Design an enzyme around this catalytic site. Structure first.
Site, PDB file in Angstrom:
ATOM      1  N   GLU A 190     -29.398  24.236  -3.702  1.00 63.64           N
ATOM      2  CA  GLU A 190     -30.246  23.098  -3.356  1.00 63.64           C
ATOM      3  C   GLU A 190     -29.413  21.821  -3.328  1.00 63.64           C
ATOM      4  O   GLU A 190     -29.504  21.039  -2.408  1.00 63.64           O
ATOM      5  CB  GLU A 190     -31.475  22.964  -4.275  1.00 63.64           C
ATOM      6  CG  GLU A 190     -31.227  22.602  -5.730  1.00 63.64           C
ATOM      7  CD  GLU A 190     -32.452  22.695  -6.626  1.00 63.64           C
ATOM      8  OE1 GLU A 190     -33.507  22.083  -6.310  1.00 63.64           O
ATOM      9  OE2 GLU A 190     -32.346  23.340  -7.698  1.00 63.64           O
ATOM     10  N   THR A 191     -28.622  21.597  -4.380  1.00 63.74           N
ATOM     11  CA  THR A 191     -27.842  20.403  -4.605  1.00 63.74           C
ATOM     12  C   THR A 191     -26.516  20.858  -5.184  1.00 63.74           C
ATOM     13  O   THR A 191     -26.489  21.785  -5.999  1.00 63.74           O
ATOM     14  CB  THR A 191     -28.589  19.484  -5.576  1.00 63.74           C
ATOM     15  OG1 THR A 191     -29.855  19.167  -4.993  1.00 63.74           O
ATOM     16  CG2 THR A 191     -27.818  18.241  -5.948  1.00 63.74           C
ATOM     17  N   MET A 229      -9.811   2.558   0.499  1.00 58.78           N
ATOM     18  CA  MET A 229      -8.579   3.216   0.924  1.00 58.78           C
ATOM     19  C   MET A 229      -8.558   4.645   0.430  1.00 58.78           C
ATOM     20  O   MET A 229      -7.813   5.015  -0.485  1.00 58.78           O
ATOM     21  CB  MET A 229      -7.324   2.496   0.438  1.00 58.78           C
ATOM     22  CG  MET A 229      -7.212   1.136   0.984  1.00 58.78           C
ATOM     23  SD  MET A 229      -5.571   0.375   0.999  1.00 58.78           S
ATOM     24  CE  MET A 229      -4.686   1.384   2.194  1.00 58.78           C
ATOM     25  N   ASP A 262      -1.308   8.785  -1.491  1.00 57.22           N
ATOM     26  CA  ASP A 262      -1.293   9.914  -2.436  1.00 57.22           C
ATOM     27  C   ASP A 262      -2.228  10.967  -1.840  1.00 57.22           C
ATOM     28  O   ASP A 262      -3.392  10.700  -1.605  1.00 57.22           O
ATOM     29  CB  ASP A 262      -1.873   9.504  -3.816  1.00 57.22           C
ATOM     30  CG  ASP A 262      -2.224  10.510  -4.938  1.00 57.22           C
ATOM     31  OD1 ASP A 262      -2.169  11.730  -4.709  1.00 57.22           O
ATOM     32  OD2 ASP A 262      -2.599  10.071  -6.099  1.00 57.22           O
ATOM     33  N   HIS A 270      -3.955  14.526  -2.564  1.00 55.32           N
ATOM     34  CA  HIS A 270      -4.234  15.516  -3.601  1.00 55.32           C
ATOM     35  C   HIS A 270      -3.864  16.934  -3.175  1.00 55.32           C
ATOM     36  O   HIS A 270      -3.800  17.840  -4.025  1.00 55.32           O
ATOM     37  CB  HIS A 270      -5.713  15.500  -3.995  1.00 55.32           C
ATOM     38  CG  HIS A 270      -6.159  14.308  -4.762  1.00 55.32           C
ATOM     39  ND1 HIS A 270      -7.435  14.257  -5.284  1.00 55.32           N
ATOM     40  CD2 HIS A 270      -5.547  13.157  -5.110  1.00 55.32           C
ATOM     41  CE1 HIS A 270      -7.556  13.096  -5.957  1.00 55.32           C
ATOM     42  NE2 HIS A 270      -6.406  12.387  -5.879  1.00 55.32           N
ATOM     43  N   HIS A 317      -7.769  -0.617  -4.901  1.00 57.74           N
ATOM     44  CA  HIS A 317      -7.553  -0.249  -3.510  1.00 57.74           C
ATOM     45  C   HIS A 317      -8.473   0.908  -3.126  1.00 57.74           C
ATOM     46  O   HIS A 317      -8.994   0.912  -2.008  1.00 57.74           O
ATOM     47  CB  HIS A 317      -6.089   0.101  -3.246  1.00 57.74           C
ATOM     48  CG  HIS A 317      -5.169  -1.049  -3.204  1.00 57.74           C
ATOM     49  ND1 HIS A 317      -4.298  -1.227  -2.153  1.00 57.74           N
ATOM     50  CD2 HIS A 317      -4.971  -2.086  -4.043  1.00 57.74           C
ATOM     51  CE1 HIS A 317      -3.632  -2.360  -2.380  1.00 57.74           C
ATOM     52  NE2 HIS A 317      -4.001  -2.915  -3.516  1.00 57.74           N
ATOM     53  N   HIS A 375     -27.170  16.789  -1.166  1.00 53.54           N
ATOM     54  CA  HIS A 375     -28.375  17.560  -0.959  1.00 53.54           C
ATOM     55  C   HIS A 375     -28.833  17.320   0.487  1.00 53.54           C
ATOM     56  O   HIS A 375     -28.845  16.196   0.942  1.00 53.54           O
ATOM     57  CB  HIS A 375     -29.486  17.106  -1.913  1.00 53.54           C
ATOM     58  CG  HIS A 375     -30.794  17.799  -1.695  1.00 53.54           C
ATOM     59  ND1 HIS A 375     -31.170  18.902  -2.385  1.00 53.54           N
ATOM     60  CD2 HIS A 375     -31.833  17.506  -0.912  1.00 53.54           C
ATOM     61  CE1 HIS A 375     -32.351  19.306  -1.939  1.00 53.54           C
ATOM     62  NE2 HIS A 375     -32.792  18.489  -1.043  1.00 53.54           N
ATOM     63  N   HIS A 405       0.842  -1.179   0.000  1.00 55.12           N
ATOM     64  CA  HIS A 405       0.000   0.000   0.000  1.00 55.12           C
ATOM     65  C   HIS A 405       0.882   1.235   0.000  1.00 55.12           C
ATOM     66  O   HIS A 405       2.077   1.155   0.248  1.00 55.12           O
ATOM     67  CB  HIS A 405      -0.881   0.024   1.261  1.00 55.12           C
ATOM     68  CG  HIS A 405      -1.813  -1.124   1.403  1.00 55.12           C
ATOM     69  ND1 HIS A 405      -2.971  -1.211   0.661  1.00 55.12           N
ATOM     70  CD2 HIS A 405      -1.749  -2.233   2.207  1.00 55.12           C
ATOM     71  CE1 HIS A 405      -3.574  -2.356   0.986  1.00 55.12           C
ATOM     72  NE2 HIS A 405      -2.853  -2.989   1.960  1.00 55.12           N
ATOM     73  N   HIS A 444      -5.652   9.006  -0.982  1.00 54.35           N
ATOM     74  CA  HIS A 444      -6.022   7.638  -1.274  1.00 54.35           C
ATOM     75  C   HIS A 444      -4.775   6.802  -1.543  1.00 54.35           C
ATOM     76  O   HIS A 444      -3.723   7.321  -1.887  1.00 54.35           O
ATOM     77  CB  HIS A 444      -7.038   7.522  -2.417  1.00 54.35           C
ATOM     78  CG  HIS A 444      -6.547   7.996  -3.726  1.00 54.35           C
ATOM     79  ND1 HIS A 444      -5.788   7.227  -4.589  1.00 54.35           N
ATOM     80  CD2 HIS A 444      -6.761   9.171  -4.392  1.00 54.35           C
ATOM     81  CE1 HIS A 444      -5.544   7.946  -5.698  1.00 54.35           C
ATOM     82  NE2 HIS A 444      -6.105   9.155  -5.597  1.00 54.35           N
ATOM     83  N   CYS A 445      -4.939   5.484  -1.439  1.00 52.94           N
ATOM     84  CA  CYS A 445      -3.887   4.553  -1.836  1.00 52.94           C
ATOM     85  C   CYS A 445      -3.843   4.494  -3.364  1.00 52.94           C
ATOM     86  O   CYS A 445      -4.852   4.662  -4.058  1.00 52.94           O
ATOM     87  CB  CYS A 445      -4.195   3.196  -1.236  1.00 52.94           C
ATOM     88  SG  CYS A 445      -2.939   1.947  -1.483  1.00 52.94           S
ATOM     89  N   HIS A 481     -28.331  13.065  -4.524  1.00 51.93           N
ATOM     90  CA  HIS A 481     -29.645  13.228  -5.119  1.00 51.93           C
ATOM     91  C   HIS A 481     -29.767  12.506  -6.454  1.00 51.93           C
ATOM     92  O   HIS A 481     -30.626  12.886  -7.264  1.00 51.93           O
ATOM     93  CB  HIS A 481     -30.051  14.699  -5.171  1.00 51.93           C
ATOM     94  CG  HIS A 481     -31.533  14.864  -5.050  1.00 51.93           C
ATOM     95  ND1 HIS A 481     -32.452  14.427  -5.998  1.00 51.93           N
ATOM     96  CD2 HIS A 481     -32.276  15.466  -4.061  1.00 51.93           C
ATOM     97  CE1 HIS A 481     -33.682  14.761  -5.577  1.00 51.93           C
ATOM     98  NE2 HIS A 481     -33.633  15.404  -4.403  1.00 51.93           N
TER      99      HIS A 481
HETATM  100  O1  LIG Z   1      -4.250  11.020  -7.614  1.00 57.31           O
HETATM  101  N1  LIG Z   1      -4.503   9.884  -8.101  1.00 57.31           N
HETATM  102  O2  LIG Z   1      -5.482   9.378  -8.686  1.00 57.31           O
HETATM  103  O1  LIG Z   2     -35.295  16.354  -1.370  1.00 56.57           O
HETATM  104  N1  LIG Z   2     -35.356  15.104  -1.524  1.00 56.57           N
HETATM  105  O2  LIG Z   2     -34.726  14.271  -2.207  1.00 56.57           O
HETATM  106 CU   LIG Z   3      -3.755   0.072  -0.681  1.00 58.60          CU
HETATM  107 CU   LIG Z   4     -35.188  16.209  -3.396  1.00 62.89          CU
HETATM  108 CU   LIG Z   5      -6.122  10.696  -6.887  1.00 55.86          CU
END
Ligand SMILES: O=N[O-]
Ligand SMILES: O=N[O-]
Ligand SMILES: [Cu+2]
Ligand SMILES: [Cu+2]
Ligand SMILES: [Cu+2]
Ligand SMILES: OC[C@H]1O[C@@](CO)(O[C@H]2O[C@H](CO)[C@@H](O)[C@H](O)[C@H]2O)[C@@H](O)[C@@H]1O
Ligand SMILES: OC[C@H]1O[C@@](CO)(O[C@H]2O[C@H](CO)[C@@H](O)[C@H](O)[C@H]2O)[C@@H](O)[C@@H]1O
Ligand SMILES: OC[C@H]1O[C@@](CO)(O[C@H]2O[C@H](CO)[C@@H](O)[C@H](O)[C@H]2O)[C@@H](O)[C@@H]1O
Ligand SMILES: O=N[O-]
Ligand SMILES: O=N[O-]
Ligand SMILES: O=N[O-]
Ligand SMILES: O=N[O-]
Ligand SMILES: [Cu+2]
Ligand SMILES: [Cu+2]
Ligand SMILES: [Cu+2]
Lengths: 334, 334, 334
Positions: free
Chosen positions: B272-273, B143, B90, B92, B138, B248, B87, B127-128, B299
């Site tokens: 909203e979302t 991970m 990384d 970001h 992974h 949401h 393992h 993440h790995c 959502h």
């Molecule tokens: O940052 N690696 O997908």
């Molecule tokens: O706002 N309901 O998915």
């Molecule tokens: Cu891993």
């Molecule tokens: Cu909704």
């Molecule tokens: Cu990445």
């Protein structure tokens, strides 16, 4: 307790939008709407495929409701005894009680009255959400629409200038999940309840059989094409209650776009394609510069051309050869 | 060479976040973290489906690490001999060496110490990423986690005003790929290695069997619901290391949202979302206005209700009838 | 009628970009381009899978065209008699006639000349769009590229400061749909027409078999890795004509990102991962700080590692131990 003037609205079927003011000198009102739920079997494509739809006011999407910031929206939701299921309504514009859903569950034969204060500007989804696995099922069966909450001063570009539309259209996009039989033909069902088991199995695999505007392949084409004239500024509200979309006006642009749909944020300018997150509405305005046919699509072109998600505009006016011209028509290669 | 004060952090399991300052008078420090990898078979749903998980510190997601701009993050990554695979890690948030991955590959029985300077503000995935096809495997085995790099002056709205949260939660969303046997039942495996061939075949088809928060269906519900009070400003950090999500808050909003997750950009308001791009973290803050239950979902409602991706908030306080009221309870239609 | 100076451009194959000015003292010109369509069977992966490609100028993506705001772009589109299908071209940068598609449909043996005025700045997709179900098919067969329309003053950060790139690369991402036979092997076909029925059936299910940069797995790796030096500011234009993507530079960032791709909008800063909506181009610039290998991916890591969507950068210069260092190399746990 709440002593404000009351105003009734007569809702109209999409893609049209009930008459309203942009900028207004009115103060807050209680704006009264009625939605009557209809469960019905409908045709969704040109081959005659049927679909067990569940709708607000008989349409997919449900109608666009338009109010101004600080209005109170009072909705009578009606679930006639001719329906089979309980239903409710959740407004993404509203604050509390799961958007209203926790206060509006009604059995067939019942109605309920909900009021919410429009404290957030923008375009917002509303949808049914009865509980549990019924939530996605009712939404993807058609029980979703949108509300627009305008600033009292109308729209602006962020940069102190007003943005006034000449007309507004509401395009509701619906992902549909119609199972197939062993032969490969779409199945038909006698009731929503009978469609449920097969429909849920398909839903969980996340790939729709149809993606349509205004409830059917080709709904916003032919006699029912959207229209404009060169020089007209058109607002296009687009919603998708369950799944992402990427609108695009073929031959045009989004001059001013609120892809997340919320007017407290300045619009982006000059877009080719924008993005409607599943569970949201967004809005784009464009001033038409050229006559002719335009297509308005989601720019997954497989969805657009093969699964149903194309509308047309027919635009009148004078061709602008400065903007575009065919210098030499098709001819044999020298 | 680097002569700065050292500060140890005791990491806590998600959705909680280790204690930290928002605005700070401290200057740069070397902030010390330890992550110990654990491969383990876990239960992921209420039916008892099992899953070959691979984790940082035993949790999905890995814990949230919080530092300030200009700190140096010194992580001891430990891969005990009780694990089966190599393992790495990384970040970001980090610059160089594939985010650290090229300097942290450890076999079972080894540990490594990586330091990186926190030059970019925001929330970021870690993440790995061992190499090649192992990278997705992974990550989708669990991970992945996130780090938050705060400005030393705390958060702001872009418009010179401070944005102080009363509490922060970290919601890590995990797409999982559990194969089925011929009968249609989810398979169980004796080791990650044994799960690999079937799991990769499924992965390449791009449709998850489960989409969960905090590692399991229903993890952030019941006794483990998130909590707030009316008047509290809550920051929700959301990450997804492999696949898009559309958060949401049902019954609420995103008052201030950094959907791309980076504090050098002003937040958007009144959403909203919002949208978390696969391979990123974003953050949304909301000040609760109403008591009761809220659901926090992606959502895509099929994913939310049917595949696992729902959390709850339980909120205490006084109901606000101005914002929302049930004008007339369900009654027979006149 | 249009009396402006004419300038010919010699297009170059992606990922490279024909020589151009950023800021310019030139006024509007008629900039002349030629695209010659080529239908051809190509190899798309390291296993030798073949694919019925349809291309502009022989490449996937088609070449990047670069002009300035207010230029007129005059394209000669050539469809030699050695091809089998009609084709056309739609520019998302252009206004009218379905982006040009309605004025450029040419049979094998024909050519056409289209001019459009570059009134919108940014990076934009261009693609074939013959009509109906042929639209997605030609696009996902490879008939798409991009154009960049620069401000005459070059790029800026929104915050009055100039943003000058040292080099630009164009990464075109292609979702491909190659059917399998009963054995599970990818099928080969004698012509695009013969591939059509199986390919359309697969397309409608929305899951690609391959997702590649520059037309093939591993195209932008090895001898054909992208390159930079520490201190160089690199612009990466990314397009996807049919399907979303989420670019990410592993070990780096997007210092300035126009994810919607339009220079009338300020860039966002300091991103980990950005989002290219299907049917669009976006652009990100990064100044490299560390030498070594970077991977540039879509951060659906299954797509990146397993379906083809990885490029490399090889970067020369001096390692910066302040930004990152391996404090203790892998060692046995104490
Ligand atoms: O940052 N690696 O997908
Ligand atoms: O706002 N309901 O998915
Ligand atoms: Cu891993
Ligand atoms: Cu909704
Ligand atoms: Cu990445
Ligand atoms: O378009 C919204 C965007 O514009 C700004 C000005 O940059 O504010 C304008 O819009 C507000 C909402 O309508 C008005 O209250 C304000 O007076 C007006 O300047 C931004 O603050 C906002 O994000
Ligand atoms: O919220 C970030 C956004 O705000 C602005 C002001 O519009 O800058 C504020 O935030 C910066 C980062 O925290 C501070 O350095 C700056 O002093 C403060 O005004 C924008 O520049 C930025 O994009
Ligand atoms: O980066 C575009 C962004 O910057 C602003 C200033 O905040 O305008 C700059 O860019 C315009 C387009 O290049 C120029 O016309 C303008 O002069 C310059 O200040 C924003 O208005 C724009 O959205
Ligand atoms: O419901 N038919 O008009
Ligand atoms: O612009 N056509 O999809
Ligand atoms: O790993 N079980 O607590
Ligand atoms: O088309 N082959 O070079
Ligand atoms: Cu319902
Ligand atoms: Cu073509
Ligand atoms: Cu297009």
């Amino acid at each position: 307790d709440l002593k404000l003037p009351r105003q009734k609205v007569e809702l109209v079927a999409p893609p049209f939008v009930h008459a309203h003011e942009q900028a207004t000198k009115q103060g807050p009102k209680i704006v009264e709407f009625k939605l009557t739920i209809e469960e019905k079997k409908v045709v969704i494509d040109e081959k005659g495929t049927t679909f067990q739809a569940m709708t607000f006011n008989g349409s997919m999407p449900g109608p666009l409701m338009v109010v101004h910031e600080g209005d109170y929206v009072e909705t009578t939701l009606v679930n006639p005894a001719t329906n089979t299921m309980p239903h409710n309504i959740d407004f993404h514009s509203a604050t509390g009680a799961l958007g209203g859903g926790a206060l509006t569950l009604i059995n067939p034969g019942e109605q309920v009255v909900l009021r919410w204060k429009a404290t957030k500007t923008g375009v917002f989804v509303y949808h049914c959400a009865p509980g549990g696995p019924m939530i996605p099922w009712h939404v993807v069966s058609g029980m979703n629409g949108a509300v627009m909450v305008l600033p009292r001063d109308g729209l602006n570009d962020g940069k102190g200038h007003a943005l006034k539309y000449d007309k507004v259209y509401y395009v509701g996009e619906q992902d549909m999940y119609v199972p197939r039989d062993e032969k490969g033909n779409f199945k038909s069902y006698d009731s929503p309840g009978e469609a449920f088991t097969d429909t849920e199995e398909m839903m969980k695999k996340l790939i729709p059989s149809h993606v349509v505007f205004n409830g059917k392949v080709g709904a916003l084409t032919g006699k029912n094409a959207l229209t404009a004239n060169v020089g007209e500024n058109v607002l296009i509200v687009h919603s998708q209650a369950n799944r992402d979309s990427r609108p695009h006006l073929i031959g045009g642009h989004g001059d001013y776009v609120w892809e997340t749909g919320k007017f407290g944020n300045a619009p982006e300018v000059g877009l080719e394609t924008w993005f409607i997150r599943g569970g949201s509405a967004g809005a784009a305005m464009y001033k038409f510069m050229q006559p002719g046919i335009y297509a308005y699509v989601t720019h997954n072109l497989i969805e657009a051309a093969d699964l149903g998600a194309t509308a047309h505009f027919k635009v009148e006016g004078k061709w602008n050869d400065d903007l575009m011209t065919q210098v030499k028509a098709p001819a044999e290669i020298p």
